[PDB]
Amino acid sequence: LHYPVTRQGEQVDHYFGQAVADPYRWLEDDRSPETEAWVKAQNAVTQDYLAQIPYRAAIKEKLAASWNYAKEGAPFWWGRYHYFFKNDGLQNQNVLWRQQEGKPAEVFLDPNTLSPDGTTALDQLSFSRDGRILAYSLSLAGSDWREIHLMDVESKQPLETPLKDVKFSGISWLGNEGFFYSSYDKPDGSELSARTDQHKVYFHRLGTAQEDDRLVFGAIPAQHHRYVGATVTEDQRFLLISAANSTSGNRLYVKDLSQENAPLLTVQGDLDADVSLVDNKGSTLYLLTNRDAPNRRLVTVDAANPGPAHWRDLIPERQQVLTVHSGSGYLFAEYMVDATARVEQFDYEGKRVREVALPGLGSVSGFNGYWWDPALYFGFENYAQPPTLYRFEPKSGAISLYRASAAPFKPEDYVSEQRFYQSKDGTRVPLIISYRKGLKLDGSNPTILYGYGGFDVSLTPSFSVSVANWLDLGGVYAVANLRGGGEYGQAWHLAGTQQNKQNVFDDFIAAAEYLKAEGYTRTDRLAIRGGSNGGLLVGAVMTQRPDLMRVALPAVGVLDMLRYHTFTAGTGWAYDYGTSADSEAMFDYLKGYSPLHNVRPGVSYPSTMVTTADHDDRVVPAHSFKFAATLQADNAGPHPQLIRIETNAGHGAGTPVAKLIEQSADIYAFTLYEMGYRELPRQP
Numbered sequence: 001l002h003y004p005v006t007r008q009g010e011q012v013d014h015y016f017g018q019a020v021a022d023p024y025r026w027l028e029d030d031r032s033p034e035t036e037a038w039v040k041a042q043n044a045v046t047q048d049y050l051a052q053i054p055y056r057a058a059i060k061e062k063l064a065a066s067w068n069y070a071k072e073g074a075p076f077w078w079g080r081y082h083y084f085f086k087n088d089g090l091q092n093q094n095v096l097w098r099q100q101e102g103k104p105a106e107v108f109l110d111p112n113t114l115s116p117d118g119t120t121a122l123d124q125l126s127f128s129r130d131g132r133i134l135a136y137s138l139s140l141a142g143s144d145w146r147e148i149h150l151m152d153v154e155s156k157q158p159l160e161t162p163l164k165d166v167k168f169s170g171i172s173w174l175g176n177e178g179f180f181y182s183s184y185d186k187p188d189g190s191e192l193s194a195r196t197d198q199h200k201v202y203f204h205r206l207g208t209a210q211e212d213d214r215l216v217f218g219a220i221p222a223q224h225h226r227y228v229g230a231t232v233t234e235d236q237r238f239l240l241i242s243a244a245n246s247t248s249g250n251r252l253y254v255k256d257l258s259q260e261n262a263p264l265l266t267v268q269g270d271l272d273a274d275v276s277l278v279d280n281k282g283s284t285l286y287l288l289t290n291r292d293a294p295n296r297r298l299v300t301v302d303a304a305n306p307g308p309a310h311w312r313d314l315i316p317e318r319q320q321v322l323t324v325h326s327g328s329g330y331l332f333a334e335y336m337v338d339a340t341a342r343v344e345q346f347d348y349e350g351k352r353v354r355e356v357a358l359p360g361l362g363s364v365s366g367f368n369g370y371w372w373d374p375a376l377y378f379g380f381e382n383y384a385q386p387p388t389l390y391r392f393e394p395k396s397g398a399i400s401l402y403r404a405s406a407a408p409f410k411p412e413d414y415v416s417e418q419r420f421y422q423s424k425d426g427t428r429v430p431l432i433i434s435y436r437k438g439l440k441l442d443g444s445n446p447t448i449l450y451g452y453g454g455f456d457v458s459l460t461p462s463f464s465v466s467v468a469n470w471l472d473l474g475g476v477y478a479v480a481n482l483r484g485g486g487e488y489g490q491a492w493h494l495a496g497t498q499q500n501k502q503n504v505f506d507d508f509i510a511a512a513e514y515l516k517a518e519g520y521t522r523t524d525r526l527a528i529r530g531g532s533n534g535g536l537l538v539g540a541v542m543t544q545r546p547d548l549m550r551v552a553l554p555a556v557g558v559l560d561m562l563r564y565h566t567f568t569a570g571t572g573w574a575y576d577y578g579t580s581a582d583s584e585a586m587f588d589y590l591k592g593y594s595p596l597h598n599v600r601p602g603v604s605y606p607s608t609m610v611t612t613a614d615h616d617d618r619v620v621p622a623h624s625f626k627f628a629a630t631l632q633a634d635n636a637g638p639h640p641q642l643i644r645i646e647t648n649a650g651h652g653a654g655t656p657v658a659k660l661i662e663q664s665a666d667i668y669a670f671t672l673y674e675m676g677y678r679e680l681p682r683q684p
């Protein structure tokens, strides 16, 4: 195996006076011909390696055939039409259809006709109140940047010129006059890696040029924030503006639109808690918050004097984490019970109406709608159960099947069991293990252990065609609900942040030890996988315990923990990670686990396939480039250290089906091949 030559530069950084060498610093320049040439060379080596795997084509065909079935989402009613997304089976992007009573359904907006390779994706959709205009945002090549387009709803004709430089933005209409959106000024330098830290809310009035858009929030010094959002309430009475510097905690302001020149009132003026508006009933605001509530609570307050001192509990905090949805005049409290959903229906006075029975143990979607929706829809799924849609009539509580899955997977063929293993410090951590029935605990099953562990993100059961295929190939898929996550509230999250981050890695190592001890797998039949913060997870575990697994799959990972805060909106992760600029203690702790700085020459690393994408502006690909370069230079063992750079794709959202299939095929082929399989374990 011949890796491309990666030169080592002379760059040396200093942290509180301590020197740290960065030989691959030049790979951070995403626009240099040198970096572009290195990417092509690496991809060529990776493709040549994968080309030697005899069953890679079979895996890809197996995946494509099983993915090829009709899919349809819940209907959305607006104006004279009902809108719904559909995919005939293998369309790169889902298609937006619509239908009005008395007439046949028709294609309304087909993203597949917007690019030659299915890489342009539809993100936000927001109709004007009269239903005559639609504003929608599009992502190009998968980056976080967006363009907002406008179209006449009835004729489908494009209107005006698209708005540019939109990012991390919703689209909220003020009647039919125009809409609010968020944007960062175009950075000087590469828009894919340059730092952006001053998010602004603008208002676009129909019939004008974007340059004339009114600046609403975020320009004056006192309002500078890395993340800002503005939403007009359903009744058009209030404008809510949220503002934050990190992914946890936010300020919230409310402006009475009924009053002329109404001042911005402070709902929450500090960043010590997360607070969001669920809905409003007149001047009464319903807020979901973790302020003085680790597992969250729902409170109410009058918009005229909305401060925290006046918040009153409506749904008090419980032992389980709360999320609140609203629709049809009811509040739906979704609780997490060991990472699985339970739903309770409440009226706006906080009185419990009933518990909503769910089809089983898994995740739910939906239960969200307007006060005027006669019925609500919700979806249910888990690792062995493809998404199923149900219609729910809130008043009677009647539940009916709206759409059964057309997937070629039979839930009854699989086992999905939950266990709680002990981490190093004694903490019991949840683990959901899925596989085809008939499995023997003889320690030989090829297994993929997946985790994330951070940012209050909870890994609840979800159906994946790719995962189901791994199970059909005879594999075991195990998902750990590591600390750092939000499964058990804020305490669970904080136990995996800053100088406690090692707890997350310890939790993951313990999951791997449990799977081996119980006989599901063994060292040479184990692979670990994770993306973004989960990519860091894999990078840290493989550098700390390179003997623990056979295969490491870090996807779009944060791997240079000393410089991650210097790119795009990376500083927004400082609440979870801390930064090398915080103090000598934080710098030492970060350097102590930073994957890039813990690869050592002479060590034999497991087979690794680092994956990233050229338009990933969430986590710049340079993290992956420098890490892969270091592994190729330092690895002393016989196992391959490869990097696969997806072209015309980003962090992940909106990736076309065609690319998703190729990626999964490459990952599974590589994993089985590195585990020594000469043929597939089961008939494809």
Ligand SMILES: O=C[C@@H]1CCCN1C(=O)[C@@H]1CCCN1C(=O)OCc1ccccc1
Pocket (backbone or CB within 6 Å): 448, 450, 464, 466, 467, 529, 530, 531, 532, 533, 534, 555, 556, 651, 652, 663, 664, 665, 667
């Ligand atoms: O191609 C299948 C791979 C091998 C086994 C699990 N896989 C996955 O892709 C799983 C299931 C869906 C999310 N996922 C994943 O790895 O996500 C990584 C990620 C997480 C967060 C942001 C970007 C990317």
Ligand SMILES: OC[C@H]1O[C@@](CO)(O[C@H]2O[C@H](CO)[C@@H](O)[C@H](O)[C@H]2O)[C@@H](O)[C@@H]1O
Pocket (backbone or CB within 6 Å): 676, 678
């Ligand atoms: O594990 C042996 C098995 O591996 C295969 C398929 O990958 O070839 C590998 O091992 C060979 C040495 O036995 C190497 O020469 C070859 O490059 C490597 O891919 C099978 O051919 C062999 O039976």
